[PDB]
Amino acid sequence: QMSFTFASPTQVFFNGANVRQVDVPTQTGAFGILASHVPTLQVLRPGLVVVHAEDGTTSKYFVSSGSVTVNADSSVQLLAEEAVTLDMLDPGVAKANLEKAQSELLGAADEASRAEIQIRIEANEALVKA
Template sequence: MAELNVDLVAADRKVWSGAARQVSAPSVDGQVGILPGHTPLLAVLRPGTVKVSTAQGTAVEAEVTGGFVSVDSNLVTIVVDEISELTGREPALR
């Protein structure tokens, strides 16, 4: 089964990195759902919740104030202005 490689970063640090089955992010044009094989994408984020369904089956969520998401070849990079504490953090994080 194909997976996404996800990097969630704030302006000052890497917040979370790992393999995922699915990512959901609040873009200014509406909620974006990203699965393996998604077409290349660059979208501006609005305030809301970023959700990552990890390859291990847990959910990682964080409230963000804005930023952008980039998708290319199953690599998802989410760069946020500000981020709240993550929920669902798992020990296998890099």
């Protein structure tokens, strides 16, 4: 009772697959999708997305930004600019980048550039959790 399509500008993970539920870390709080959810349109934030298969296994991916769309039927389109798995990541370089981004805050002068630096530290702090 679902048609899930988790696509990327490069590769495809699912194309019309049927799964029981998908959890998305979008903006304005988390989310849960099951059965005939109410229609919604929301952008994403850096976080981890888990998809629960019909068998019961849970697949995990990391998403940077994109869009979410749940239509009138049980059709969901999740198009993301980035889609990666943890197995090709280094936690140590993540901690080093976070350590530099910490001092980058005081290094900043103008509020727009510091806003960019804040986005940097937000992304770095978000990813180091898992």
